[PDB]
Amino acid sequence: RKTQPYDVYDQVEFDVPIGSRGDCYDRYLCRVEEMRQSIRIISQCLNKMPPGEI
Amino acid sequence: VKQDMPPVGGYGPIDYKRNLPRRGLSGYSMFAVGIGALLFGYWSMMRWNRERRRLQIEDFEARIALMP
């Protein structure tokens, strides 16, 4: 999503969580914070909506 | 006239912060609470056991005096 933005993902502020120790609990926290980043992306998406056509 | 669904002038924010209050109670004080309740129990237990020893001494006197 970030390196090759295949759609309009390039124009929202979000930041992907990274792991450090490479670990399953750490992976769990990574998933939960990707959810919370998805909350961010929904908020900015609703505020940036263009009314073009289907 | 057009009747799509845009936001109505824009939308309010939604936070995404991790609300964890770390309450708490300053756990050294919780040790103070636990040792205080523990020692309360020891003092009251001490008093009650020694008075029950008194009344058990009365029961010893009962079997002593009654026996012959």
Backbone angles phi, psi at B10, to 5 degrees: 110, 165
A43 neighbors A12 (Cβ within 8 angstroms):
no
Resolution (angstroms) equals 4.2
Residue B6, Ramachandran bin (φ over 0: left; ψ between -120 and 50: alpha; else beta): beta
* Per-residue CA distances from B58 to A41, B44, B45, B53 (Å): 81, 22, 20, 9
Structure tokens at B61: 């006197």
CA distances from B45 to A16, B35, B59 (A): 60, 15, 21
Contact B31, A54 (CB under 8 A): no
Q: Using CA atoms in the order A31, A35, A36, A37, what is the torsion angle rounded to 10 degrees?
A: 90
B16 with A46: Cβ contact below 8 A? no
Taking chain A, what is the end-to-end CA distance rounded to the nearest angstrom?
A: 23
Residue with token string 């909506």: A49
Experimentally determined by = cryo-EM
Return residues 21-50 of A near B (CB < 8 Å): 36-37, 39-40, 42-43, 46-47, 49
